[PDB]
Every structure is written in C-alpha cells, then in structure tokens.
Amino acid sequence: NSEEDKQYLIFIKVFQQAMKGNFAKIYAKTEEGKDPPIKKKVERLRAELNYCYDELSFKEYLSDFLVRGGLNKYFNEHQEEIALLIKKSPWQEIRIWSLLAIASYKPKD
Amino acid sequence: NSEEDKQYLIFIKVFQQAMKGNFAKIYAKTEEGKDPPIKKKVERLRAELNYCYDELSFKEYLSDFLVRGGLNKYFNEHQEEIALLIKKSPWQEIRIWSLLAIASYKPKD
Amino acid sequence: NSEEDKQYLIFIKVFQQAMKGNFAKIYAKTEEGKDPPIKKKVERLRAELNYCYDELSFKEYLSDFLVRGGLNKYFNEHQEEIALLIKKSPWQEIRIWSLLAIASYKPKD
Amino acid sequence: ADNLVKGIHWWSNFWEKLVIEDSKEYLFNQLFSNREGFIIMAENSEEDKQYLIFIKVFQQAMKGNFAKIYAKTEEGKDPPIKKKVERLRAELNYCYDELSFKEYLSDFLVRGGLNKYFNEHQEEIALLIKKSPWQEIRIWSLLAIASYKP
Amino acid sequence: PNYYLYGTVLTRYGLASLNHDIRRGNKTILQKGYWNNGKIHSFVGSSAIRWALRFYLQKQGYLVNRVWDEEEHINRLTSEDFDPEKFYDDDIFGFALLPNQRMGALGMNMAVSLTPYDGAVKLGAKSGREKDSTSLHFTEYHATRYQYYFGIDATHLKDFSRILPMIDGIMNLPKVGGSSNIFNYPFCPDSLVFQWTNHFASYISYCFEYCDPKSKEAKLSQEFIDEVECGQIDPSKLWIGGTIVKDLQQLDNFESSPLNKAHIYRNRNEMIEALKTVIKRDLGL
Amino acid sequence: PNYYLYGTVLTRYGLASLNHDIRRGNKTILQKGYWNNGKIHSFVGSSAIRWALRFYLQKQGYLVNRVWDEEEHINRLTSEDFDPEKFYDDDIFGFALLPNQRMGALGMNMAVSLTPYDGAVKLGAKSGREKDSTSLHFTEYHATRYQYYFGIDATHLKDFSRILPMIDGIMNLPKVGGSSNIFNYPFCPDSLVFQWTNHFASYISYCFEYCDPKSKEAKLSQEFIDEVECGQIDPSKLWIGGTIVKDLQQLDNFESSPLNKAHIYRNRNEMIEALKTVIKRDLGL
Amino acid sequence: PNYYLYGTVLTRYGLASLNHDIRRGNKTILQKGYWNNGKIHSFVGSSAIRWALRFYLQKQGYLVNRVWDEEEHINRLTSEDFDPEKFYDDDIFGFALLTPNQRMGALGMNMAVSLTPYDGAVKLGAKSGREKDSTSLHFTEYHATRYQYYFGIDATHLKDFSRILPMIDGIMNLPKVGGSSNIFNYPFCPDSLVFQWTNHFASYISYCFEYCDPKSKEAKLSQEFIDEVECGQIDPSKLWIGGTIVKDLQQLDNFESSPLNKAHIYRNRNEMIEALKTVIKRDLGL
C-alpha cells in the first residue's frame, strides 16, 4: 500500500545492509585483541551525516557509503525505484530516512 | 487494542529507550562534579521539542535524538511499523507522543 | 515517463554493462586457484571515481571506462541520448549516478 | 435520583448539568458544596478508575509546576499560586480543538517533572489520552484543578 | 394547478460568525451541531434568512406590515390587524398574533455549513493599558460555504405576482444576521439548484458536498446526480446555475447524461430570468 | 437610492507578526487557521483594521468620540452620549453601551495570508549575562501578502460625505496593531478590486488568490475572472487598480475580454480619484 | 504636521554569521526561512540592529538610559523610571517596564533579509591539537551575501524633534551588529540607500533592492519599484537614493526621460545624508 512507502522501507533496508557491509569491513580490518571500533564508527557516521550543505554534499556521501557497503541484495531487487528515489526527493528527507536506518539496523544485530 | 494503539505504544517505548541512552551518555561523559545535569537536560529537551516549527525540523531533531540514543530494542523488534508511523503521521502528533513518552519516563531502579 | 529519468536509467544500465565487460576481462586475466580481485577492483573503481577535479578529469575517465568495458549494447542503441546526457549536466551529478550504478550492478549476477 | 430510578449510572452527565448547562452555577455551586460527594460516587464508579488515575497524574504535574514556581519565587515576595491556578483554568478553557489541547496537556505534564503515577500506569494513561475525546480530558483536567488539595 | 418552487442554495467562501448561540464565559460560541458523517457543522438559522427577506421587501418599497426602524433597532406594526391581501410579509411569511394566523407560503430550512467545523477561534481585546473585566474576549468563527433549503407554494400566495420579489430577494439577499463588524460574510448565492414542478416530491434538498474536508471546492452530491440519472426528477423541471455549472460541464460523458437536457446556465441572472419567464407563463402573470 | 462599496485589497510583501494569539510558551503564537486547500494560513484581525482606520481619522482633524492618547496608552471619550450626527467615529464604526447602538457603516472581514504559514519562528535574547526568565523568548513571523474584504453601506452614513475619509484612510492606512518595533509591516495596499453598485449582491470576496507556495506573484484568480466573463459583475461597476494591472494587461485575449472595459488604472491614485468623482456625482455631494 | 521617514538600506557584500539561531549541535545555524521564490534566505534579527543603534548613541556621547558596560557585558540603567524627555534611547526605541511606563517607539524596523539565497557555507573549527575533548570540534555556518532591511520613523512622535538627526548618523555609521565578529567581521555600514521622507503612512518601498542572480553581487533595483516610480506614485521629490546603486541607475537607458531622474539621487552617501538632514530641519523648524 502506497508504493512510495514501500520504496522508503526498502531504502531503509538498503542502507542497513550497506552499513552491515561496512561493519564487516571494519571488523576485518581490526587485528590483535584491540576492540573493533563500532560505537566510534557509528558516532562518526552520524556526525558526518549531520554535516552536509545541500545536493552534491551528502548525496556524494550517500552514494559513497552505499558503495562501501558492497553487495546489497535489497538494492539488487529494485533498481529503478531506488535510483529514482535517490536522484529525486529533497536531500533532507533522505537524511531523515538514513538516520532512521541508523537506528533501525540494530534489529539485525 | 487496535493496531494504531500498539504502534503508538512502541513509539513511546522507543523514545523512552532513546532517552535512556542519551542520559547514560550524559552520566558517563560528565561523571565529574556532585551530579551531572539531568533535570536541566530534560528541560532543554522539552524546549528543543517545543522549538520545532514544521515537520522537517522536528523530524530532523527526532531522528538525531533516536540515533544519539543508541541500540533501541523496541525499535529493533519493529522496523517497518514504526518507520511508517514516523513518516506518515503528522509531525505534531509525533510531538505529543514524544512529550508523553518524556513525561512517562520510568527511572531505572 | 519523465524522459530525463529515462536517460538516467539507461546511463545506469550502460555503466553496469561496461563494468560487466571489465569484470569479464579481469576474470579472463586471472588463472588457477587465486581469488580474482573483484572487491578490490570495486574499491579501486570507487577510489578512481572519487579522485577527480572537474570537467576533463572524470570525463576522460568515464570515456576510458566505457571503452575498456567493451561493446555496450545499450550504448549502441542509445548513442545520442547517452552522449548528450554526458556532455550536459554537472559532472558531480554524473559521478553520483555512476556511484549508484556501481552499487547497482549486483543483480546482473 | 433520576438516574438511579433509571438504573443507569448516576454519573450520567453531572458536569454537563453542573457547568455546561449551569453557567449560572446554580447547581455548580452545589457541586462546590458537594464536590466530595461527586467524587465519592465517582469512586464507586469502577470505570472512573482510569480517570481517577489521570486525576492523580495531573495533580502531581501541577504539584511539580507549583514547586518550580516556589523555587522561582523571590524571598519576601508572595508567590501568585492563585493567579497561576486562574491562568491554568483560562488556558485550558482557551483550547479549541484536539491538537492544541493535547499540545498544552503534554507540555504541562512534561513541565511537571517526574510523575510516579504516570510511570506506574504508563500504558493505561497513554491510551486514555490517545482515545478519549479532548473535551472529556479537558473536563477531567478542570476537575483535577478544582479538586487539588495538598 | 398546484405549482411549487424548491431550491437548495450555496453561498460563497468566507469567514462567518453569523449565528452565535448562548455564550459561555468569555468565548462567544457560534451555534453548531452534527450533520453528515457525524462531524460537527455550523448552522445559521432559517429565521435569520426570513428576516433578511423581510428586510429586502421593506427596502425595495413593497408594503410590508412589519417596518424595521434601523436607527431605533425596533420593529413596528403598520396595522394591528394582519391583512395578507395587502401586505407582502403577511402574505408570504405568515403571522400569529395570539383571522388570526396564516400558514405562510415560504417554508425555509436551516443554513448548514458545507465543511465541518474544526473549532477555530479568534481573540479580541480592548485596546489601552486601562484594562477591565470587559478587556479581552474570544469570538468563534468558521470559514465555510453555507447551504440552506427552502420551499414555497405558488398557489398558497394570496397574490401570485408576489413570487417574483421573493425570488429577486433570494438572488439579492441582504445581510443575514451576524457580526458584520469583524466577520462580514456575504450570503449572496453563487450556485443554485431550483425545481419548479406541479408534484410536491422534492429531491434537491442539500444536494451539495465537499471534495475535501477542508477546502473550497463545492461539488455536486453523488446522490442528486444519480437520482437524475435513474429517471425521476425530470430534467425539464430542473434549474441549476452558478459556479457548479463549470464542474458539471467538466464531468465526463456530460453530453450523454440526462443532466445535459436540464436548464443549466453559467450566469445566475440568465437562469433566474428564464425561470421567472417560465413562472409568469405558468401562473398567467 | 441604496449604494454599497465592496472591495478586497492586497497588502505588500514583507514579514508579519501583527496578530499574536495567546503566547503559548515563549512563542508569541501568530494567529492562524485553516483556509483554502486545507493549509494553515496566518490571520490579521479585522478589528485591527478598524482600529487603524479609527486612528487615521483621529490623526487628521475629523472629530471622533474615542481619542487615543498615544502617551498614556488609554482611550478617552469626549462625550459619553454617542452622537453619530457629529462624530465621524460613531457615524462610521458604531457603538454599544451595555441608546441607539447604531449599526456601523463599515463591515470588515479578517485579513488572510495569501500564502500558507510553515513555521516562520524567530529567536529573542536580552543582551548578555544576568539572565532571568525573561531572557529567552520566541516570536513568529510570516513573509507573505495579506488580503481582506470590506464593505460599506453608503446610504447608512449619517453624513454622506464621510465615505471620502475612509477611502483616503484605506489608501493610507497607518500602522496596523502588531509588533512594529521588530516587524514593521506597512499595510498600504498594492492591488485593489473595488465595486460600486446599487444592489446588495456582493461578489468580489477574497478573489486575490495565487497559492504557488512560497512566492509573491499574487495572481488575481480563476473564479473571479470567470464571474466577469459570464456576464454578472458588469465591468462598468468594477474598479481594478494596482500592480495586479500589470499582470492583467499581459493576459492573452485581454482586449476582447469583458474585463477590458472595466475601470482599470495601473496607478492607484488615479483610480481612487475616479472612484471619488463617481461617488460624489452619484450621492450629490 | 505628521512626517514619516521610510527607507530601505542594503549592506555591503561579505561573509556574515550574525544570526545564530538555536545551535542544534556543533553547527551554529543562521536564522533562516523561506523569503522569495521558495528559496531559503538568511535573516538578521532587527533587534540586533536596534541594539547596534543603541550602542552607537551610547558611544558618541549623548544620554542613554541603558548603558552597555562593555567589560562585564551587563546592562545598567541610569534611572529606573524611564524618562523619554531626557534619555535618547527611551525617547527613540521605547521601553516596557512591567510618566507612562510604556513607550511606543519612534523607530520601527524590519528584519534584515539576505539578497542571496543561502545554500551551504558551513565552516569547521578545531581547537589547537592533542588532548581533544568534547569542545574540540565545532562547525560555524556563514553566508556570502548582501543584507537589506527596512525601517521607518515618525519624527512627530519623538519627544524632541532634534533626536531624528543622531539616528540617521547611527544608521550610516552603524557599529558591529551582534554576531561572531571575532572570526566573521561583517561591516554593516550602508553602501546603497533608498530613503523616502513624506507626510503620509504609505511607504511602498519596503524591500526595493533585489537582484537574485544566486551567488553574485550585482545588487540591482527591483523592477516593481521602478515601475511604481514611473507610475507617478511615490513622488520623486520625496525620494532619496544614494550609494553604489546610483551608478547602475545612471547606466540605465532613457534614464533622463524616466521620472527617476527627477528624484534626489546622489552617488556619494554623505552628501545625500546632508541634503536629507537639511530638508528635515527645514520642514521641522530646527
């Protein structure tokens, strides 16, 4: 119902899977008994997400973060819908959705 | 109870857990002195929530607070329901719900 | 609908097909049980996309990437639209579209 | 008596008669003279329970607000608690729709501070606020203000 | 024969506070009640429009038994004995002094608000630092199009020619009792649905509905159009004019629906002229 | 003969905090309510414009009963016995004792904002250090043009020449009650739609409508133009002047449209002079 | 009679951070809102400009009831009972106490608008190095634009009519407007003026300066204002235009035939101010 909301939910899932990929990357990078920075990484992500000055800024960051996430199936299923959602829509609402995803990935683990 | 009431209850619990996280961060960051500010923090939180004038700014502040809270068990168990509730419902009703959650915050015994 | 978004989607498909060709090339290059470098190749592609200083830089890069991709059927059917879209539009927007495409290739295989 | 004969709840609509209909306060004064009696019967009413808990919640919130005013009050000066109560009645009566009244009620509850009763009956009071028509919640808030007794 | 005139009228969009009921405390509540879908709507009483018609008949120069002294704000009687043969108001609106009484040709219903009443209020306060008990006050207002239903009996009129001034007054209704100082709401019609038939049965009562709960759209109701489709309410006896004409003409398949063969005029004056010509032909005037 | 002057004028673009409602917390709530298309629009009280006209009349001769002190912030009554035959204020705006009570010659509607109001809030602080409860506060503003509708019964004036000063004042309206210190909003009008007819039927309600969310284009309307095309609201009785004239002259087929033969003056002063001449000729002044 | 001084003044181009709104996080956000064409513009609070005028009157001698300590940043009152007859600040800006305890305020001004839409322009701040704590990282928003505000005075309402003269000089030589002048020093002195001195309440010159051209500094005069001038409305004899906009006005074609040529136009600001003050004194008997 209200396919725009469906696209919004699948975008939330896409961002969650991308952050999962980046978490796997940082967990692979850390070595020895050092505590893998996850809280630090999450706070850094939130701080960089808040820091943005329209259009090019934070959209370049969104795309770069999604690429850093790597293989993401939810984005694989739906190409045109998410591509149009990212190209369209005011960037602030995309920021809202991404921050909600930040808080909604924790269900996964 | 109907589904909407359940969603509203999960939103209240989600906000309360976010405040738990924020207050824990405040306690950890400012352990020095007689006592960290919580009553002043609660008053500032209320003032910030009442400051918000439209849907964009209020949703921005709400998402920022939610991510600042940390892991959100109530927001873990229910991703799509609460996300759709936040996106769809008018921001004023979200403000009432957040203020009610603020006033209903049970301190940890 | 919305012909410019049609051009954007066919650009996404063209980029995906070109990177499919590049992936096939590098799979052909490697031999024996070593894992073919693809996640590393994706990281290199992202880093080279990020590195650019407007106009000629990243435009020679996109042209060279499309060339090294091989024969692009979508580009063959859509020469004029793709060329006009590339010549116009801010290069940062084209980089954002290319990064989307990057993370959009996976459903191909 | 009529409701009793009818067999229906005595509290069919006392407030309506006492205030809404009785602007002159002919029986509203009787309410003032017999407010305890009204509460007594309301106590008998089990359904009232939830509204009684809400009454206690609002009384605790206004206790917190009055404590804040007492802290704000300068030494020697007389705090305007009566004036603040009159302001509370006027502000509540000013509210014209569900949204504004719920805004003011939630803001007042937040300003009250930590409420024990609202903590113990979190879900029940939350659902009561969400469901009940705002006119009714305003009526019971006015009764809470009138029934405040430290 | 037995001819009657029925109509449902819609007003323009504006802020209205025309029917303050018994006020409480400091707020002047405007009278309201329930209507379609269970949502509260604001009502303007039919007695107000009857008074407005009386005032129109007084101003235009007709006899009118009851004279309204504007400066005195008082009502006087030209003659203590009601004479419906001579006085237009006694003929139309009837009388009862407590012959003695008349049934009254004009039968009008209340003026409902097309849009539900949210509860908007306005604060007013006396200026100056010198403030007293009467300093500040609240006045309730509503931004709505108003709709009322009326029905008259042409045969019941003692003089049949009296139907023309009443129609002219309805189309040129003077101020309807309200608060013109701070909410000057014109009650002039902007969309009519008139029926002039020999049968009594009327299916045009409150035939207007809103497109959105808070909007100035004022589309025709589905029930009225469907009933015109089904076969009753003959289009030859239908008279629709005003702003709703545009919406009707923008409807699909309009050239095939029975609404096409009904008297529809964009300009209200033309439709009124045609209906008046029809009435004068029918009643031998 | 009865005569009325109905009009709807549009203000200039600028910030507005004229009609603070209740000051809920620190936010001086700029009064607002629902309007066209269900969007919240800020409102300016009609009593504010009535007070502004009263002040204008007091400032320039024009004996009035209620004198505004301007120093003590209080209102003084020259004579408690209201005499509309002598005072301009009593003759125009009316009075109520709680005698004659008048009726008021001028009927006003609440001014609406031509653009929806999103949040438009502003901070406020008091210098630095030694901060008390009065240190921090908020004020709501609004960057739009305001539109209101007014009507005068010319005949109802005790002195028929008193219609001229109100036109002069509406053209030269002083500060309308509001936060002039922080948000100095001039209420002078930049586009006028006046009609001077001899029957009550009063169209040209809030015709000025542009929406176009956050802009300042202020197009006239579609429904009012229609009304003009259809045949009613005859152009000879219409007066349009202001910046809206520039937009009107650029419409296609404007030369053949009936709106062309209406009194159109780009300059407001010329149109006002012509309307004054017409009124003086018609009323025998 | 009654005389009103209406004027719209445009500041000079530069970087400004004078309107920090709420400080949501590290970022100190400029006070901003939708202004025209649905684009976000940055606004400077008019109360800040009133404070600047009060400070100007305090600095150049004169008598002002509210004295700025300038060392403790604390406000002091020479006399608790406000006396508009004596003090300049109480006579001009008014006062609310909570002689009359309330003053109307001879000066009424609007908030300063940014002539350019505000897009991005956030700036980092990092404190020294090493031993970094929660206050080590911070962001400051800014904006490269020209600010423009609208003000109006009724000289008749002043207790002393001669107090109009210091106010104009303060408008010209305005001190710093409340903002981060330590790192964003924005001079608020006028560079283009449009003054109207008339005896009626109509202004029609609310915001005459408008250029759009996103990130430029052309600062042209709005088309609607020029049309109003050509209409015959707003008599050129009552108009005072001075500043850099004068050059653009002279470069316009058919300028001599235009009614704007008959208005009091001076390229230099000080000479225009002198002429305006001469006219004001002549029409006020000073």
Short mmCIF file of N, CA, C and O in Angstrom, two decimals, chain A residues 5 10 22 48 52 67 103:
data_model
loop_
_atom_site.label_atom_id
_atom_site.label_comp_id
_atom_site.label_asym_id
_atom_site.label_seq_id
_atom_site.Cartn_x
_atom_site.Cartn_y
_atom_site.Cartn_z
N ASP A 5 5.76 4.50 0.16
CA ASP A 5 6.18 3.99 1.46
C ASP A 5 6.93 2.67 1.33
O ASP A 5 7.87 2.42 2.09
N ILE A 10 12.17 -0.15 1.67
CA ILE A 10 13.26 -0.88 1.03
C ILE A 10 14.53 -0.04 1.00
O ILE A 10 15.64 -0.59 1.05
N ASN A 22 29.80 -2.33 5.72
CA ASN A 22 30.89 -1.53 6.28
C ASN A 22 31.32 -2.04 7.65
O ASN A 22 32.50 -1.97 8.00
N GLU A 48 29.07 12.71 10.41
CA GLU A 48 29.23 13.04 9.00
C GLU A 48 27.88 13.17 8.30
O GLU A 48 27.75 13.95 7.36
N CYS A 52 26.41 18.48 6.31
CA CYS A 52 26.07 18.47 4.90
C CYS A 52 25.52 19.84 4.50
O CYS A 52 24.89 20.52 5.31
N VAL A 67 28.34 2.32 -1.76
CA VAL A 67 29.39 1.57 -2.44
C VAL A 67 30.29 0.87 -1.43
O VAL A 67 30.65 -0.30 -1.60
N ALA A 103 19.28 3.94 13.21
CA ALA A 103 18.69 3.40 14.43
C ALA A 103 17.91 2.12 14.18
O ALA A 103 17.54 1.42 15.13
#
